[PDB]
Every structure is written in structure tokens, then in C-alpha cells.
DNA sequence: GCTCAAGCGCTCTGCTCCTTCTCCCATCCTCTCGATGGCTATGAGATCAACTAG
RNA sequence: AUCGAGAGGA
DNA sequence: CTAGTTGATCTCATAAGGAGAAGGAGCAGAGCGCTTGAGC
């Protein structure tokens, strides 16, 4: 399973128009991770106005 | 009842203005036999009328016995209107001022077109681009022409529809008088009168006389 | 008895079933045990291209 | 040195 | 340019998987040119 997961999202790179785009070119996320954020800088929050 | 009257009848018969001036008008060796009685005759005036030069008799490949006919100067004409403007018009001009005055044979065997005929083994693609050069074999290749492909399929798909209808006939006889009068199906393009001939050369019918005409029946 | 029908066989998908066929099965590391592995001659003719003189 | 097998460690 | 010689070089000689994808079969029905074909 982790060697087809990987084959498959080998070449996914986030490119310099901050978009996502495979080996081909095709995009596959406008911006990354839908906000254009990487994952080591995030941390659980709490929305003060929904609840 | 001569070979040199019997060809010309059929070519008349042709639908020339169905295939767009392209492929020349063929008449069949089957046909042939069906003007002219003697049979045992009609090769022998077809062969010295080969090799006089005035008729090209191409083998087709429907069944064993196809033999198809092409008017000489109509086949000469319509090669290059149809070769010029292309890839392969240019040695197909040599094959045609050379081989064609030269030779009569239906099928050139390898030594005979590259040594005879000078022919070396790069051109010989474009003879094969558009219909001059068949496939009989490693070593020989019947002569070929051009287009011939939309003939022979409309040209199987009437011998089958008219014989068939021939079968669907009440008691399995269909007046040959009832053929002309009746209207030509849809099916078969080529003519009904073009296909009656070739079931009378090819047996598949036989001219039955009698008070109303003439007849034609499946072999018993 | 003159035109809409009724059929009709032939062909064209097509629809599902059954069969067949190729690939695929975590990474890295250590060690031992076994198997493997080929080894006719010697002489005769004959050509040929390079030295070694002429 | 090559192949194959077996026994093992995380 | 010619012979003679020396090696190469050759030739011939005697003896208790799976999931899925791909092909093909067979039947099943729709459609249509056709061939009648017979009721008003």
C-alpha cells in the first residue's frame, strides 16, 4: 500500500505560482492544501463565533 | 458472337459516372462468357486480343475464377490523372511507359519487374501507395488498379442480394423479364442488369427457354 | 385491386456470461550448505600478406 | 566469484 | 616488380490466489429494405 501510494504521488510538487502540478503539468490544487499552507506550521485552533 | 463485340456491350453497361471518373470502367470475364455461346472461343480471341494490346484483363480477388477487364487507353488515362499531384507519381509514369506496352502477364515475378523493367526495391512502395502493384506472393505480385476496392464490395454485396431474391422467389423461378421490369433494388448499386450476367457466366443460373421468355434457375 | 400493412429474414449492435491471461504480493542485514565449473590431438593441404633479398 | 536453498536479527 | 620464407588462418580429416482486464460466444431484440400481398 506504501509503495503504491508513493508511485502514485511521486512527482506532486508545489510549484512557484504556488500551484500543485504533477510531472505532466496538469494542476491539481490551485493552491495547496486549498489555503496554500505547510503542515509544520499549523496548530489546532478554536472558532469563537460558531458555537 | 465476337470477344471484340462482347467486351464492348458490357463496357457500355458500366455505371461510369458512379465511381467519380476514377476508376476505370471494368467488365468481368464472367460476362464475358454470357454474349458469347463458346466459351472454349472467348479466351482464345481475349488472349491474342491481350497481347494485341487493346484490353488489360487484371485478376481480381472475389473467388479463384476473378478476371476482371480494363480498357487499355482508359486504364492508360486514368493512372495519371489520378498518380500526378502525389508521392508515388513518379516512377508509376515509368511502370506505365515501360511494363505496361511491354508485357501483358498477369502477375511479375520478382526478377522479371526488378531486372526486366529496371525497378529497384525503394519505389516499389509507391506502386503499392495506390493500386498498381498487388500482393500475389514473396516472389510475384498481380498487376493492379487503382480504386478497385469500392467495386468488388458493392460488387459481392449485389451477386448476393440478386441471388438471393432468385431463391426468395415463388417456387424458386424468377422470370428474366421480370428482372428489367421490375425495379432495381436499392441494394445493389453496380446495376441489375450488371450482376444477371455474372451468375449466367458463373452457372450460378442457367438460361432456360421457354413461351414466356426466358428463365433462370438455381443448378439441381 | 392499388396503399397501407403485415410479416420477415438478414444484419447490427449489445448485453451479460464464461473463459483465459498477465501481474502482484515490506525493508535492510548476517551466516552456512550445496552445485558448478571443461581441459579431443596432429597433420595435411592451401591461400595470403608482409619481409628479404634480388 | 555466480545461482539456488536453508537458518536466522531488527 | 619477383621468388622464397614465415606466420596467421582456415579447412578437412578418424575414432487450502486474487483482482482485474481482455476475447469470444451465444442469444436477444431492434430496425429496415424487401417482397409480397390482399382488404376498401
Same mark, same amino acid.
Given at each position: 500500500?506504501?509503495?503504491?501510494?508513493?508511485?502514485?504521488?511521486?512527482?506532486?510538487?508545489?510549484?512557484?505560482?504556488?500551484?500543485?502540478?504533477?510531472?505532466?503539468?496538469?494542476?491539481?490544487?490551485?493552491?495547496?492544501?486549498?489555503?496554500?499552507?505547510?503542515?509544520?506550521?499549523?496548530?489546532?485552533?478554536?472558532?469563537? /463565533?460558531?458555537? | 458472337?465476337?470477344?471484340?463485340?462482347?467486351?464492348?456491350?458490357?463496357?457500355?453497361?458500366?455505371?461510369?459516372?458512379?465511381?467519380?471518373?476514377?476508376?476505370?470502367?471494368?467488365?468481368?470475364?464472367?460476362?464475358?462468357?454470357?454474349?458469347?455461346?463458346?466459351?472454349?472461343?472467348?479466351?482464345?480471341?481475349?488472349?491474342?486480343?491481350?497481347?494485341?494490346?487493346?484490353?488489360?484483363?487484371?485478376?481480381?480477388?472475389?473467388?479463384?475464377?476473378?478476371?476482371?477487364?480494363?480498357?487499355?487507353?482508359?486504364?492508360? /488515362?486514368?493512372?495519371?490523372?489520378?498518380?500526378?499531384?502525389?508521392?508515388?507519381?513518379?516512377?508509376?509514369?515509368?511502370?506505365?511507359?515501360?511494363?505496361?506496352?511491354?508485357?501483358?502477364?498477369?502477375?511479375?515475378?520478382?526478377?522479371?519487374? /526488378?531486372?526486366?523493367?529496371?525497378?529497384?526495391?525503394?519505389?516499389?512502395?509507391?506502386?503499392?501507395?495506390?493500386?498498381?502493384?498487388?500482393?500475389?506472393?514473396?516472389?510475384?505480385?498481380?498487376?493492379?488498379?487503382?480504386?478497385?476496392?469500392?467495386?468488388?464490395?458493392?460488387?459481392?454485396?449485389?451477386?448476393?442480394?440478386?441471388?438471393?431474391?432468385?431463391?426468395?422467389?415463388?417456387?424458386?423461378?424468377?422470370?428474366?423479364?421480370?428482372?428489367?421490369?421490375?425495379?432495381?433494388?436499392?441494394?445493389?448499386?453496380?446495376?441489375?442488369?450488371?450482376?444477371?450476367?455474372?451468375?449466367?457466366?458463373?452457372?450460378?443460373?442457367?438460361?432456360?427457354?421457354?413461351?414466356?421468355?426466358?428463365?433462370?434457375?438455381?443448378?439441381?
Amino acid at each position: 500500500i506504501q509503495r503504491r501510494l508513493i508511485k502514485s504521488m511521486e512527482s506532486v510538487m508545489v510549484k512557484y505560482d504556488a500551484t500543485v502540478r504533477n510531472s505532466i503539468n496538469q494542476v491539481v490544487q490551485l493552491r495547496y492544501g486549498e489555503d496554500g499552507l505547510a503542515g509544520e506550521s499549523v496548530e489546532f485552533q478554536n472558532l469563537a /463565533t460558531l458555537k | 458472337g465476337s470477344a471484340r463485340a462482347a467486351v464492348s456491350e458490357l463496357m457500355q453497361l458500366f455505371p461510369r459516372g458512379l465511381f467519380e471518373d476514377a476508376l476505370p470502367p471494368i467488365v468481368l470475364r464472367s460476362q464475358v462468357y454470357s454474349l458469347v455461346p463458346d466459351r472454349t472461343v472467348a479466351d482464345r480471341q481475349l488472349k491474342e486480343l491481350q497481347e494485341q494490346g487493346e484490353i488489360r484483363i487484371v485478376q481480381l480477388g472475389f473467388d479463384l475464377d476473378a478476371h476482371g477487364i480494363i480498357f487499355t487507353e482508359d486504364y492508360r /488515362t486514368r493512372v495519371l490523372k489520378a498518380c500526378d499531384g502525389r508521392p508515388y507519381a513518379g516512377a508509376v509514369q515509368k511502370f506505365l511507359a515501360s511494363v505496361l506496352p511491354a508485357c501483358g502477364d498477369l502477375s511479375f515475378q520478382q526478377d522479371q519487374m /526488378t531486372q526486366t523493367f529496371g525497378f529497384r526495391d525503394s519505389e516499389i512502395t509507391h506502386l503499392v501507395n495506390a493500386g498498381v502493384l498487388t500482393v500475389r506472393d514473396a516472389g510475384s505480385w498481380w498487376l493492379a488498379v487503382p480504386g478497385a476496392g469500392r467495386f468488388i464490395k458493392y460488387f459481392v454485396k449485389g451477386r448476393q442480394a440478386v441471388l438471393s431474391m432468385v431463391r426468395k422467389a415463388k417456387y424458386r423461378e424468377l422470370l428474366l423479364s421480370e428482372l428489367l421490369g421490375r425495379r432495381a433494388p436499392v441494394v445493389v448499386r453496380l446495376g441489375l442488369t450488371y450482376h444477371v450476367h455474372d451468375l449466367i457466366g458463373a452457372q450460378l443460373v442457367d438460361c432456360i427457354s421457354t413461351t414466356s421468355g426466358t428463365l433462370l434457375r438455381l443448378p439441381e
